[PDB]
């Protein structure tokens, strides 16, 4: 199957692999072609990071379709999202799609001192509920500029 | 020996075929035409040639690269001799979707629908959302060449969006096919006035469905002086407010608006005398 790896500058790296091939084998081929060390690479599929030691088949990737991945460097960090407060101050958070809503509220408390029980987080009109992850709402690396509303 | 006239170049993006056509030379007793197609990048060994009979006025070239300029030259041939050529340039394109439409539109999601293109060079499609006012990219994804449907979520109420689908080939892409979407914040309904004393009244309304708002905005004034308008901000989880310090025997006009951050719904208005 063909893989297409989209980078942050708009480049597309092409590979041809088997479904038994591991993620870390794909990073290895990106290293040879771009000089980016394997340990600096994060490969994102549908907004979610693929983990080493798994085959592509273990992610339920359909091998008759073209696989489209995003390359993000560890140096870029996690998702940078924005939270606007009761007053309208914008703050910056760095999260992962596997973070829970309470993890997210904990971070807001770390930066702003708002107890998590006082925090109501809304995403584009939908309240984000405790007990869920960002992923559950499909908040993941595909959202390039995400804004949450506080009250 | 006169060249041909009226050279036309047709690079069909849907089939990938370049059709070269011309008007036959006025010179008597020509023995054919020679057609060359060459990228104008100065790369040697990439030139393509066709030769056709004197009664032929077209030729084709397959597998040209999108985004690369080619020069096409047509020579009138008469035995040993050739004319000065007629020439022109052309840059083939990647086909772009033609029937992209919005479907299955809900308060919290919009569906993108299109017919997948029938070319084997297509490797997939890129879907982008951009807030049109500030030009901020909001969302990006990539899908396989067989996919003809996508669900876009996360559009802020009140914001205008450019939503584009881009056809991808190996080493190329089309111009974006773009739609715009803006979903207004829905108003409250069913405005009612109770507990009406001489200087006070209770205002109640029904909230809009299926949106978590930042707040409600209540505007109220005597009918005979709009310039005396007062305002209160109401919690988005509350559906009532008690107005106090009102003028007696005076009809007030009252409006309630839904608010999502900076954006308001159309106002819910009513009038009520104290």
Residue numbers in the entry:
A (entry chain L): 1 to 151
B (entry chain A): 1174 to 1447
Quote the study that presented this structure, word for word:
Affilin proteins, artificial binding proteins based on the ubiquitin scaffold, have been generated by directed protein evolution to yield de-novo variants that bind the extra-domain B (EDB) of oncofetal fibronectin, an established marker of tumor neovasculature. The structure of ubiquitin (Ub), a 76 amino acid signalling protein conserved among all eukaryotes, features a single five-stranded β-sheet enclosing a short α-helix. The crystal structures of two EDB-specific Affilin variants reveal a striking structural plasticity of the ubiquitin scaffold, characterised by β-strand slippage, leading to different negative register shifts of the β5 strands. This process recruits amino acid residues from β5 towards the N-terminus to an adjacent loop region and subsequent residues into β5, respectively, remodeling the binding interface and leading to target specificity and affinity.
The crystal structure of the Af2:7B8 complex with a resolution of 2.3 Å shows the modular architecture of the Affilin, which comprises an N-terminal Ub-like domain (Ub-N) and a C-terminal Ub-like domain (Ub-C) tethered together by a two-amino acid linker. Ub-N and Ub-C display the typical β-grasp fold of ubiquitin and bind the target 7B8 in an elongated conformation. The asymmetric unit of the crystal structure contains three Af2:7B8 complexes related by a 31 non-crystallographic symmetry-axis. The three complexes demonstrate that Af2 interacts solely with the target domains EDB and Fn8, with no direct involvement of Fn7 in binding. The two Ub-like domains of Af2 form a total binding interface of 1179 Å2, with the major contribution from Ub-C (811 Å2) compared to Ub-N (368 Å2). Target recognition by Af2 is based on three sub-interfaces (I-III). Interface I between Ub-N and EDB includes evolved residues from the α2β5 loop and strand β1, but also native (non-evolved) amino acids from β1 and β5 of Af2, which interact with EDB residues located in β-strands C/C’ and loop regions BC/C’E. Interface II is formed between Ub-C and EDB, including evolved residues from the α2β5 loop and the non-evolved R149 from β5 of Ub-C that interacts with EDB residues from β-strand C’ and the EF loop. Interface III involves interactions between Fn8 and Ub-C and does not comprise any evolved residues. The most striking observation was made by the discovery that the β5-strands of both Ub domains of target-bound Af2 have slipped from their original position in the β-sheet (as in the structure of Ub-wt18) by several residues towards the N-terminus.
